[PDB]
Ligand binder design. Structure first.
Ligand SMILES: Nc1ncnc2c1ncn2[C@@H]1O[C@H](COP(=O)(O)OCCCCC[C@@H]2SC[C@@H]3NC(=O)N[C@@H]32)[C@@H](O)[C@H]1O
Length: 304
């Protein structure tokens, strides 16, 4: 049961020192129990500083997700704000039968956040944005490439609009900053098709954060903007496909005309990227010849 640590971080969020005694009085608990639950916050990835014999404090204030503020500025779908969840993608999947296109979910903390191919996504409490959105496509796509490109484009453009000028996209589904992974996108597919989109963006916390690049964004504002723009963008993709996104992709293509490596299955091939075709397939030039690819993991190829 997570109610007591949640009430605890809710109090500690303002960055002010609280005594063990006053936290106990406020929460109607002993100082021993408080000390126990403080440790739980540490397990969740919260940086907590203990003043020996006196109490506790966060080193800095943290901005907690405000549901009322996020909901208030959005329209056209439900948005659930969850303090603790296993995975925002899974939360939407569990209820995929009662959801409408645009229904979204945001978590402070994921206990079982996942990347692609069964990997894990480190999702400490309050440090980053963990967002998911449900969408229904009336005609099922044959692949997740188009959707991923649309998500990556939109989230990059939003971050760029907010000051993160150098954010680029890694085909087909990661945002990169300074050639390092800033954000991860996971699209899960199931006549029509049901889609659960998942985005993890590193803010405060190989990898790179927005803060490590001097970008300090309002997490509530960022969440709302992403949800707002994704809904409209998915409507556009729904109506017109990838076509109106092709030029917008070129401006964000992080690996175009660069030497890259593509891990496909358990084969590893080398080539130079020439961008994408109209279907969003990677155009990889091997030995002077360009071939389209609708799969594989792309990465930079250099011993620099
Ligand atoms: N915060 C992190 N930042 C950078 N690298 C990391 C992070 N955590 C783990 N990694 C590394 O990346 C790999 C997994 O990332 P990915 O498969 O590229 O996965 C890409 C897709 C990620 C989707 C995450 C969102 S979050 C909200 C939603 N809910 C959920 O469970 N997934 C999505 C791991 O092997 C690990 O080494």
């Amino acid at each position: 049961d997570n109610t007591v640590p949640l009430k605890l971080i809710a109090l500690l969020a303002n960055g002010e020192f609280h005594s063990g005694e006053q936290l106990g009085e406020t929460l109607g608990m002993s100082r021993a129990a408080i000390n126990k639950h403080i440790q739980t916050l540490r397990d969740w990835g919260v940086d907590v500083f203990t003043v020996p014999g006196k109490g506790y404090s966060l080193p800095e204030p943290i901005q907690l997700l405000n549901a009322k503020q996020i909901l208030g500025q959005l329209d056209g779908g439900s948005v659930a704000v969850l303090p603790v969840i296993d995975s925002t993608n899974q939360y939407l999947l569990d209820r995929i039968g009662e959801l409408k296109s645009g229904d979204a979910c945001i978590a402070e903390y994921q206990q079982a956040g996942r990347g692609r191919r069964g990997r894990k996504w480190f999702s400490p409490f309050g440090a980053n944005l963990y967002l998911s959105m449900f969408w229904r496509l009336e005609q099922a796509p044959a692949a997740a490439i188009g959707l991923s490109l649309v998500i990556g484009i939109v989230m990059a453009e939003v971050l760029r609009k907010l000051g993160a000028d150098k954010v680029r996209v890694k085909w087909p589904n990661d945002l990169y900053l300074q050639d390092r992974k800033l954000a991860g996108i996971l699209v899960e597919l199931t006549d029509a098709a049901q889609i659960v989109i998942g985005a993890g963006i590193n803010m405060a916390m190989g990898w790179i954060t927005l803060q490590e690049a001097g970008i300090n964004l309002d997490r509530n504002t960022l969440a709302a903007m992403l949800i707002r723009e994704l809904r409209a963008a998915l409507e556009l993709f729904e109506q017109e496909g990838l076509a109106p996104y092709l030029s917008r992709w070129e401006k964000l293509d992080n690996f175009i005309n660069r030497p890259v490596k593509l891990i496909i299955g358990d084969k590893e091939i080398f080539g130079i990227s020439r961008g994408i075709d109209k279907q969003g397939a990677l155009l990889l030039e091997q030995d002077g010849i360009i071939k389209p690819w609708m799969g594989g993991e792309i990465s930079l190829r250099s011993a620099e």
